[PDB]
Structure 1
Amino acid sequence: HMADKELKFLVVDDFSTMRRIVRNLLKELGFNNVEEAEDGVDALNKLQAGGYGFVISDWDMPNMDGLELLKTIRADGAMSALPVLMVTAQAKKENIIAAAQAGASGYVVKPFTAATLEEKLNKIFEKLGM
């Protein structure tokens, strides 16, 4: 997949407010193909529907947390390469290590600025040649 207007994003967080921030930032950046999920299970249901090129995900969520979500994606043959940007209040170095080692494409700590989201997305786009 490529970082063009068509790139389809999945935004995952148990709080509407945080999903709404991310969706609106993505709109500003020119990405209007954006769906939302409320937890890891919900996310996987939509991912399995097909077509997604990018996941932005919270950590602390009911039913399936974001670290489990990330691990599932990375271990699944059909989506193991999917970009996953963690966007979370979890700020301990050991959280960052766990997510990094699990295969996070990037990691943004809440609260975050519009500029921070943009540059961390762009960093992932460049790393993956999108």
Structure 2
Amino acid sequence: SIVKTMIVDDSAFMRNILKRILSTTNKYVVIGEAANGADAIKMAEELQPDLISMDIVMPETDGITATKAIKEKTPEIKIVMCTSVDQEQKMIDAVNAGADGYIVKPFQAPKILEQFNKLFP
């Protein structure tokens, strides 16, 4: 009934839009945010979310590196990549890294909820 969620994106305004969308749901409760993949790995270990929304392109450590690391340690965490046209070229890397789904910027709330609810019926 509650899905503990992390939001990872180097863009604060994209994190904020996604937080506002999820805030309208009792179900997806945001428990942490991170702005790069290294912080995401550490936060995932500390918080043990059910779900991570993972931007792909981020400075220093990207979402592919973070997805692989988190999947190696705690494979039960669902990781949904947060993609966009400018990240298209990294989507196959995310498939190979074990992503569980995708949501798309610019955000559409119904599509996000469809995607999340498929993983958390």
Q: TM-score range by the shorter chain?
A: 0.7 to 0.9
Question: Does the 8 Å contact 2:67/2:97 carry over to 1?
Answer: yes
1:58-86 CA distance string (max 9 Å, x none): 0111121001111111112xx12210010
Counterpart of 2:32, as a letter, is E
Is residue 68 of structure 1 aligned with residue 46 of structure 2? no
Compute the RMSD of aligned alpha carbons. 1.5
Question: What residue identity is the alignment partner of 1:108?
Answer: I
Kindly report which structure 2 residues correspond to 1:1-130, keeping only aligned pairs within 5 A, or say none.
Answer: 4-5=1-2, 7-30=3-26, 31-76=28-73, 79-89=74-84, 90-92=87-89, 95-126=90-121
Counterpart amino acid of 1:54?
Answer: L
Q: Residue type matched to 2:20 in 1?
A: N
Question: 1:33 offset after TM fit, Å?
Answer: 4.0
Pick the structure with more strand per residue: 2
- 2: CA distance, partners of 1:34 / 1:19: 13
Cα drift, residue 121 of structure 1: 0.6
Structure 1: how far apart are the matches of 2:105 and 2:48? Answer: 28
Is this contact kept in 1: 2:7–2:32, CA < 8 A?
yes
CA contact (8 A) 2:83 2:105 kept: yes
| Runs of 4+ residues deviating >3 angstroms | none
Distance 1:112 1:91 in 2: 16
**Does the CA-based 8 Å contact 2:18-2:107 persist in structure 1?**
no
| TM superposition score normalised by structure 1 | 0.82
* Letter paired with 1:26: L
Which ranges of structure 1 fall in alignment gaps of 5 or more residues?
none
The AA in structure 2 aligned to 1:99 is: A
